[PDB]
Amino acid sequence: SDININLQRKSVVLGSKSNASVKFKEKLNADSITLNFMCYDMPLEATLNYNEKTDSYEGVINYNKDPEYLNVWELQSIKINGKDEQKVLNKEDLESMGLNLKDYDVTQEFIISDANSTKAVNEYMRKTSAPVKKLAGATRFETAVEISKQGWKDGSSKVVIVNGELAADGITATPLASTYDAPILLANKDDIPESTKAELKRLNPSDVIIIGDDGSVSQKAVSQIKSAVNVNVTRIGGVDRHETSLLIAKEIDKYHDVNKIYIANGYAGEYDALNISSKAGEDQQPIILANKDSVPQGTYNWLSSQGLEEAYYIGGSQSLSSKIIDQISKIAKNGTSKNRVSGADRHETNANVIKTFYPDKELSAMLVAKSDIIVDSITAGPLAAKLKAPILITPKTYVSAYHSTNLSEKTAETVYQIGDGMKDSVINSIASSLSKHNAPTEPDNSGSAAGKTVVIDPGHGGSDSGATSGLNGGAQEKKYTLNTALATTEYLRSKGINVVMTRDTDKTMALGERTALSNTIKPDLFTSIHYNASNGSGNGVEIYYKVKDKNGGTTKTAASNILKRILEKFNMKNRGIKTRTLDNGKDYLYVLRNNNYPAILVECAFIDNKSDMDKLNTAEKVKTMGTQIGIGIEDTVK
């Protein structure tokens, strides 16, 4: 077209930055142009400088003005800053050149104050939350259309199409859609629904790129797409997911060099591929799908000739073994095991990718999708890549415990809610944490208007490592209690029980602070999680409970239930439930003696006993230990 205006963000807050690129068919003989916008009577301008590499005017809009009234910035004009002549295109001129100016409107939202119930006012401290933009429709097809309208309101010359019910197949499509700066819309194998047909017409593309062979998206779907818009249809699809990821990588290499790869297990690491999608999309570098010990030969031969600078492995040892790291490390400049990112499950892996690949404490945005489906994260991917923002996944009814630290420490200017189905409670909890640094950890439980509440306490932390041992490559009680406790919290939340963790990260915390927290929360049950030690000798599981219940009571029932559940998955010696007192008759353990609520202390296993530790030598086994403890707790409080 004669003029194309590409704005990075259509939803901002005070202080946001948005990249802008304007391309003119005509050579203007001018080093820069100035865009003028207005919101009611307040002006905002941005100067874009000519970049000969791209034949485009590029720069950044800084939303550093706070409007007294209204909150939508509307483009008014473009001034061409020639040396000898300046020309100004006003609204009428821009409309005469084919632009529809409302396609460039940018909404400036602000942090809202609401809490969960401002029924009158009792104190003065309102809970704040980052503004939420919801992109969703009745089904995955309409949700992909709302995403498309958000980042491509002015249209797109290319559209990527993936089969919407075989979405696992388009899991490596985000980096290519990002390279094209195109949205992904969804098809059925032999048709496209009306929602996709109408958005293809609205975007007015010249080309549709189908990912998948005719078995995924057939010629019958191709005809319905061309009936909607008579585009050129390109198809990229191999014999299986591994070859298709290779063919996508070769397609990206036609636009710019491929020198970095993010590897995931094709059939066993679908959520690994999904979790690194927004980052691979922002970098416009491919996701290469592999087998557990190697990438296929065809992939290996092409990667060997690419001169890779970096390779990352998304997935644990069971998905990508040391053999594929050895293979790829030999052909990449930086591809050692240090580049592995993994997690006990899809949520921990999502949190570790965000922690590793989005290190900034202030994000421009956070896109939040349900973790039970794959397709919403695939269609959100191109938009997350355009916004240079991560996708967070979590179940519909609770914020995963593995997100606690990232949500507390970081802020995001805008939170996008992808799809319909996530509880208000959950998205609002995430939006509140992301409105401040070092945010407190609390809406994550507030979720239930009523229900049972448990306090989970991972023993030791920070300056106190607790017991240590040389088993399982070196073990520290403070880290095993934290990994066990996160899994217990995750199980309880998935059953609708509110959980407050005394700590959700490595930090120093005194017994008196853990107990004060318990006394403030007034839980149904407080569970401290620890690991035992003696020498290699002691082994087994034991739980301490309050002496006052020695002949019956909530803590004795709690300790019996948890011990039973642990033993259901772990063949360790049953050391029984125990009480222990000081000479004065009171409980020896501070968190039992000083707790006004039911409390127990679980010694999961002896961290210095090889037989016990052999049953806890992978993140998934530690996760099973936490889950059993959570089941025992649910037995007790439900």
Residue 433 contact among Cl ion, Na ion, Ca ion, none, beta carbon within 5 to 8 Å by kind: Na ion
Shortest Cβ 597–Zn ion spacing (Å):
20
The one catalytic residue in 165, 603, 620, 634 is 603
Q: Which is nearer to Na ion, 429 or 488 (CB)?
A: 429
How many residues lie near Na ion (CB under 5 A)? 2
Q: Does 466 bind Zn ion (CB under 5 A)?
A: yes
Give per-residue burial for 85-95: e unless 16+ CB within 10 Å, then b: eeeebeeeebe
Confirm or deny that 100 is annotated as ligand binding: yes
Q: Which is nearer to Zn ion, 269 or 626 (CB)?
A: 626
Confirm or deny that 347 is annotated as ligand binding: no
C-beta separation of 49 from 32 below 8 A: yes
Strand order in the sheet with 411-418: 132-135, 411-418, 362-370, 391-394
Shortest Cβ 411–Na ion spacing (Å):
5
Reference 150, options 420, 380, 474; nearest CA is 380
Let me know the angle formed at the C-alpha of 325 by 238 and 239, rounded to the nearest 5 degrees: 10
Q: Does 433 bind Na ion (CB under 5 A)?
A: yes
CA distances from 489 to 103, 509, 605 (A): 45, 19, 19
Query: In the annotation, is 603 catalytic?
Result: yes
Among the candidate windows 123-131, 218-226, 289-297, 530-538, which touches Zn ion by CB under 5 A? 530-538
SS3 for 616-630, per residue? CCCHHHHHHHHHHHH
C-beta separation of 247 from 238 below 8 A: yes
CA distance 302 to 310: 15
How many residues lie near Ca ion (CB under 5 A)? 1
Confirm or deny that 477 is annotated as ligand binding: yes
Confirm or deny that 460 is annotated as ligand binding: yes
Exactly one of 346, 347, 530, 546 binds Zn ion (CB under 5 A); which one? 530
State the Rg of the chain over Cα.
28
Confirm or deny that 19 is annotated as ligand binding: no
Shortest Cβ 388–Ca ion spacing (Å):
14
Confirm or deny that 154 is annotated as ligand binding: yes
Confirm or deny that 362 is annotated as ligand binding: no
Reference 33, options 63, 4, 11; nearest CA is 4
CA distance 125 to 123: 6
Residues that bind Cl ion (CB under 5 A): 9-11, 17
Shortest Cβ 10–Cl ion spacing (Å):
4
Q: Does 6 bind Ca ion (CB under 5 A)?
A: yes
| Structure tokens that stand for 623 in this block | 């996760």
Shortest Cβ 409–Na ion spacing (Å):
6
Exactly one of 375, 439, 533, 607 binds Na ion (CB under 5 A); which one? 439
Q: Which is nearer to Ca ion, 132 or 182 (CB)?
A: 182
**Residues of this chain, 359-398, that bind Ca ion according to CB under 5 A:** none
Residue 186 phi, psi (nearest 5): -115, 145
Left (φ > 0), alpha (ψ -120 to 50) or beta: where does 611 sit?
A: alpha
Reference 77, options 42, 106, 101, 50; nearest CA is 101
Contact positions vs Na ion (CB under 5 A): 433, 439
Q: Residues marked as binding? A: 6, 100, 103, 154, 460, 477, 530, 581-582
Please give the positions annotated as active site.
603
Contact positions vs Zn ion (CB under 5 A): 459, 466, 530
Q: Residues marked as binding for Zn(2+)? A: 460, 477, 530
Contact positions vs Ca ion (CB under 5 A): 6
